[PDB]
Amino acid sequence: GAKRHRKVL
Amino acid sequence: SMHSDLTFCEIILMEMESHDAAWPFLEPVNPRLVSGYRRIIKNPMDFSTMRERLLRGGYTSSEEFAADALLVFDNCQTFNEDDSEVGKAGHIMRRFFESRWEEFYQ
């Protein structure tokens, strides 16, 4: 799955 | 010497790059692929940028090199979930980096 920011950010 | 220290830094960088887990850090992050990266990370750094700096003689000490390596690892921790593939990869790189830096103290 794709690289993505922490949900909280 | 500066030269012998920087030679060893170059070796550490090569050895990091040789790991399977180095893949997220080889080139600068493109925020067109990775949403919010520019908003969240103020000071981007990656291994290609470090390699170019070494080749041009832009590090005057192994401490300057270490500062960039740490930025790579800290940016990764900051941006990515710890259980993400990239998060995990940064933890692997930092651990390996420290394991090699130890040779300065043997």
Query: Is the separation of the CB atoms in B18 and B86 below 8 Å?
Result: no
Query: Is the separation of the CB atoms in B90 and B16 below 8 Å?
Result: no
List the structure tokens of B54: 């070494």
**DSSP string of B38-86?**
HHH-SS---HHHHHHHHHTT--SSHHHHHHHHHHHHHHHHHHS-TTSHH
| CB proximity under 8 Å: B 52-71 to A | none
Of B33, B79, B85, the CB nearest to A5: B79
- Residues contacting B19, CB < 8 A, separation 6+: B92, B93, B96
Resolution value, angstrom units: 1.6
Dmax over CA atoms of chain A, in Å, equals 18
B81 shares contact with chain A (CB less than 8 Å) = yes
From the candidate CATH numbers 2.40.110.10, 3.30.420.40, 1.10.3720.10, 1.20.920.10, the one assigned to the domain spanning B1-106: 1.20.920.10
Nearest to B12 by CA among B44, B42, B50: B50
The Cα–Cα gap between B51 and B48 comes to 5
Query: Is the separation of the CB atoms in B91 and B22 below 8 Å?
Result: no
Measured between its terminal Cα atoms, the distance across chain A in Å is: 18
Which residues in A have their CB inside 8 Å of a CB on B?
Answer: 1, 3-7, 9
Which experiment gave this structure?
X-ray
